[PDB]
């Protein structure tokens, strides 16, 4: 544990010199940010992408609803066949 503590102290020192270099790194990053701060249309593009995603979700929901309607139509056809068999049995019973 003490060996690993000395190791992490050395890691803190190397992170300190990494931050010493990150001073100039962040200076360059701030220069690039001041250069790119000129830009907007990105917000409209993101809104259009969100609207397209909502439309795709609505289309997936409509496809799921069409599948459920097909399953309900199959169940209704099965129920109609059962009702026709029951009506034939009832006609035989009435005779």
């Amino acid at each position: 544990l003490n060996v690993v503590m000395k190791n992490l102290e050395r890691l803190r020192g190397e992170y300190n010199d990494l931050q010493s270099e990150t001073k100039t790194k962040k200076e360059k990053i701030k220069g690039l940010q001041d250069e790119i701060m000129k830009i907007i249309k990105l917000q409209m593009q993101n809104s259009k992408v969100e609207s397209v995603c909502q439309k795709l979700d609505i289309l997936v929901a409509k496809l799921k609803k069409v599948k459920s309607a097909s399953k309900k139509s199959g169940g209704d056809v099965v129920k109609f066949q059962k009702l026709l068999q029951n009506s034939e049995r009832d006609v035989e019973l009435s005779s």
Partner: protein, 95 residues
């Protein structure tokens, strides 16, 4: 006597070890692409320097669309199969 129980752990001390070896191989597999990707990056230095090839990628997407066309049936068939399965299940349920 649980002193033999740790012996079983010794077996794991080999088993997972083998898996670790496989993991290393997996890492090697990653390397088999990783450095290769670097080469691909170098290929970019030869590709972007000499433009419309991305349009050809769209054709590749069209090929994927062709696969999607198969999916346009396959998944659909799968859905149909699901429906069939459901029907079968229903039948089974009925039975």
């Amino acid at each position: 006597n649980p002193s033999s129980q740790i012996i079983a752990r010794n077996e794991e001390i080999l088993r997972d070890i083998g898996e670790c070896e496989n993991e290393i191989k997996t890492k090697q597999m990653s390397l088999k692409k990783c450095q290769e990707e670097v080469s691909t990056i170098e290929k970019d230095m030869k590709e972007y320097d000499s433009s419309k090839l991305n349009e050809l990628k769209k054709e590749l997407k069209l090929l994927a669309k062709e696969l999607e066309e198969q999916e346009s049936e396959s998944e659909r068939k799968y859905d149909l199969f699901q429906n069939l399965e459901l029907e079968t299940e229903q039948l089974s349920s009925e039975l």
